Curated annotation (Swiss-Prot), chains A, B:
This is 4-hydroxyproline betaine 2-epimerase. Mg(2+) binds at D192, E217, D240. Its EC number is 5.1.1.22. Binds 1 Mg(2+) ion per subunit. It comes from Paracoccus denitrificans (strain Pd 1222). It holds the Pfam family MR_MLE_N. It is an enzyme of class 5 (isomerase). SUPFAM superfamilies: Enolase C-terminal domain-like, Enolase N-terminal domain-like. Disruption phenotype: Cells lacking this gene grow more slowly than wild-type on tHyp-B as sole carbon source, whereas growth is normal on cHyp-B. When both hpbD and hypF are disrupted, P.denitrificans is unable to utilize tHyp-B or tHyp as sole carbon source. CDD domains: enolase_like (cd00308). GO terms for biological process: amino-acid betaine catabolic process.
Length: 367, 367, 354, 354
């Protein structure tokens, strides 16, 4: 097989009952990639930054990066994801979030070609139904507590409470009121500082609440700050935004700098790298989620496929933007949350067939 | 431009309702510097140690250091603060507190020359009104608690409780009674040991009060002692007196030895170095104050100008001695606390025009 | 698809190799192999291999052989450790997968990065002049890398050997490794490197434990590679994350199979740590497995694939077995491992499970 | 004063450079530039530059261009990362500031410490004898420092190049840097330093990651400089505070502009860490910006300002553009950057915002 065509698409996704406050976002522009083989067989990828301020990545940026690489990828074998990743690195440094769109499209194409689900190309389906988790927005303490209780009732096995960007007393009150509503339900709790807490405040949050079993997710902006407070914090600490590449994961795992990860597939550079990430975590019993920043059926299915291969006791869940998205790409097999969990699609490849019409004509085509 | 004249002045400032107990001080002698350019344009600086025992600096010392350097500064370009600092280092080693008086006078002169506020020469005004904080003296627990409540009512967003020099049980009682009066007002709390606590007592203070959200400011005498207890202390620790120069700040930030700073402008050597200090803290999300030991309108305006450039979420405030000083240098635009905050002066340079007569004739003049 | 039968074979090469044949419901078969290089090199041996396989086999009947990670966890649920035995099952399943999808194993592990894989030649211990001659002969045959085995005798002799080998190969563009095979006290590893700064070897597993290696690393100016100490992925992660070594000699059977070997490769690539893809010993089946993972390694980080072929008289597959040619190995063309063993050579299974 | 217009230009040099023109309400204009040295040197590229600028520009209209730190925070509020693009806006604002106050940019960054700024010459990869000749020719032209690029081939050749260059320049008082451009495995970086103690190079960014550099630093007796690893001020603070390097090659666009470059300079000066003030590539505008910050560096710590000028046929400003003369660069005399680009050379903007 050989890549004959690459098509790049721009597409809008508005948030139902927005805004979503982390980066505050009111609507999203996702970028889709279609790879077409010699045989006419096609595979789909997707990348969608959650606003331009959450990570060093944006929509205009994804398309420029993809247009930079695409002519150099015509003629490449799409059935060789590691060889393909190296070829990409030879065309553009960094830009993992754009390279991930190509990597996903290639696995989709591989699965369709061999007649196999992407999860089975990544080591095999460990669970047909994968846990998810609900991430609350920043808001009033009592209202976040009400939402938390409602989501536990829906069947979510884990909740992530977003905090920061305001006095930490309010964050602390939110955490306590949420715990009061969900204690004794067996629901797991994460508190996500989204890089916004000075060490002063991360120390206070943990010191004041030893009896509340949260993990502190990316509380500070840099890995250096996190490494400095770790010894003084008795709650587990997870890395998210700091987990920028496999090399950094190796540093954090090998030097014992964290107790887990919230990992985004686009950030690490795609499924080839994500599988290696998964294996490092499993060797060290580090729980992790398999998420992305945002996006529709394509990126959501990719996250679900890698999530289905994770050892169940280490699976902190797969987050998807589906509940905030009005129009799915695939009304028949698209990714849906049901009872706080996600059923893996049953068909070959990602198991998703995008209604290509929805996206409009490509903003760029390459052959 | 060139420096034509440098004039050094000695001037007394008595503390209203003194003494102020940290070093116990009953009145203060400040030192002022006037730099006069070829064009006759003038700029003002000030340095005022808070008694001779708080830091390795004193009033007689400032004037001897200034007289040592001044003949070597005639003819220098006052519009080049880094070049000027290097020229000073070539005349006298150390003595940052005296070099700072010259540095401030040079920025004042620059601002007047270009028609720009000093804060806009330091990166720009981030806030026209800067927060301040109130520092209580050492005293009886109930009385310090009463004062704390009164200052919160005045609008101070942060309080610093001075402790030490007596059994730590009394310091601990003070902290608890203050917290009882201000809890739930959103007021931030610092406890300043002013180098006086053995590690034994700093450990006890933090261990006994996990539920009281203070930061522990310079609890022990040396940075070495602080580095040794850090891992065992669950409250944030700020450096003050230990932050002697930019090199030490780089050590503390880069090795993760503290969670913030109380920084004095004269100690670091002036505004050129203070701006670099600010940038290091901002890169690491380390909150800090912009203070000095003491002094009137000149040094207070200099602290306020650098304070106005600090990222608001990292600004622990600007401390000034104004409420303890009877006669301001500038009755029209001089620095005043109002509602626990300080309005930045609106005019060019420091925005301060000292009533030169107040100071008396210079004790030393150079041309 | 499901595993319907597992057959275990014993075969002499001598060294006692152990072959595994996995048969699916369809009758489609995959082959694996494991062959400890004597019972004293590693915590592994031939009788142990067959015992471990006998322990796991009944609990693997009915398993899906197309899911290498799920299969590895299932094995872990039947027997702790024993990676050298688990590796035989893992290899057979990849062979079967490849045949099922009609794809080379290397293209199931990320893709072929090179059809011609470099090898390296490992000299046994011997007299300095004789080792130096063999070094020169092997360079002439095309091997791009030589590994000189030392230890078990006064280090003066090891140092003499290294200097004479270097005399012969300097300027040929040949890379040099000196393998202490866990046998040097720190005392001697320090002396070896201290006396020879102008000789560009890497020091491979000079000392017995990772602890001893971490203790001398700062005092040694030659790159240090881990071999025997790289017992599992967790230890690789420690060594890479804490900067305890500059490369690896990695054995497929030691790490537990191709699934784990692929993750090990990705860790090394992220940190620019060169490595070889070897095993202790064995014929076409284990040799093919090493060649396949070797073909996926970034060429600039590939220290080579070692195989026992030159020491083995009878290949399992006369047409397409692994052969060294010009110091390199060509990747087989066929699906799976690309190897088809003549089962008549092995005799009937010593154990069958169904 | 407020930003009223931002105009983005594309121009070939080939390398694709991107120019930015900021126009204030008064009509007063400032110029910036960013030009990645190919899309593979750094996580940056020309199409990416224009995309990032297009993302930020609308949100910058109305901003006060006389407040470089407030402006930087405002940019951060519009787009995370992308320092190489932010740098173009930062430079244009300093140019505008300088013109507004009638002051050279260097005197807005602390003051001119030298009117004549040292440069250094960077040899591309090539054959050892040819590189050695170019080294000698460039020393004769007056360059006080030479940087030799290596890697991407067997290290024996890099070592031969270094030795031949040294043969030619020893005794001329020329300083030497050897740049590995992220391409050496620890194995080879160790060998390079181990074999050449008598050659006084610093080893610049030998390995890909800061992690690998921290791991070999104690075993390497030559000074080590960071380049590509110095991605932001936070990483500089780590490297300086933990003693992970002995100096820096710093690129203005990588660190995000002159505001951050000034703080970086102050950190290096406090720790006596020598550094260069460079960028990837580009014409008079980026070259002038580097020269201005370079003119503020303590002379004893100034490793030089590199510019692409010798490789560029058409300067933007025929009268006062940046030129290398005698291995040094004279600081322009005029206000702002002291440069006045002939806009007719660039063609109309590819994007305009108002
Ligand atoms: Mg997160
Ligand atoms: Mg203090
Ligand atoms: Mg050869
Ligand atoms: Mg070995
Ligand atoms: Mg010279
Ligand atoms: Mg460089």
């Amino acid at each position: 097989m050989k890549i004959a065509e690459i098509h790049v698409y721009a597409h809008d996704l508005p948030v139902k009952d927005g805004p979503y406050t982390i980066s505050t976002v009111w609507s999203l522009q996702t970028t889709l990639v279609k790879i077409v083989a010699d045989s006419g067989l096609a595979g789909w990828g997707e990348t969608c930054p959650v606003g331009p301020t959450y990570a060093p990545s944006h929509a205009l940026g994804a398309r420029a990066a993809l247009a930079e690489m695409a002519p150099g990828l015509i003629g490449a074998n799409p059935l060789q994801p590691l060889v393909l990743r190296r070829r990409m690195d030879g065309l553009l440094c960094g830009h993992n979030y754009a390279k991930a769109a190509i990597d996903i499209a290639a696995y989709d194409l591989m699965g369709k070609h061999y007649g196999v689900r992407v999860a089975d190309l990544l080591g095999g389906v460990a669970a047909e139904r994968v846990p998810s988790y609900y991430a609350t927005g920043i808001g009033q303490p009592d209202e976040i507590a009400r939402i938390a209780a409602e989501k536990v009732a829906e069947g979510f096995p884990r909740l992530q409470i977003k905090i920061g960007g305001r006095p930490v007393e309010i964050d602390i009150e939110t955490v306590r009121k949420v715990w009061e509503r969900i204690r004794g339900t067996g629901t797991r709790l994460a508190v996500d500082g989204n890089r916004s807490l000075p060490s002063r405040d991360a120390l206070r949050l943990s010191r004041e609440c030893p009896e509340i079993p949260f993990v502190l997710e990316q509380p500070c902006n840099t890995l250096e700050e996190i490494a400095a407070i770790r010894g003084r914090v008795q709650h587990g600490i997870y890395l998210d935004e700091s987990g920028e590449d496999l090399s950094t994961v190796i540093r954090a795992a090998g030097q014992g700098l964290c107790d887990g990860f919230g990992m985004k597939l686009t950030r690490i550079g795609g499924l080839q790298q994500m599988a290696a990430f998964r294996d490092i975590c499993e060797a060290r019993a580090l729980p992790h989620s398999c998420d992305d920043a945002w996006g529709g059926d394509i990126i959501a299915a990719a996250c679900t496929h890698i999530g289905a291969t994770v050892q169940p006791r280490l699976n902190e869940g797969v987050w998807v933007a589906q509940p905030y998205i009005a129009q799915p790409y695939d009304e028949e097999n698209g990714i849906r949350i049901a009872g706080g969990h996600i059923d893996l699609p049953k068909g070959p490849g990602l198991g998703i067939t995008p209604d290509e019409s929805l996206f409009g004509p490509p903003v760029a085509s390459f052959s």
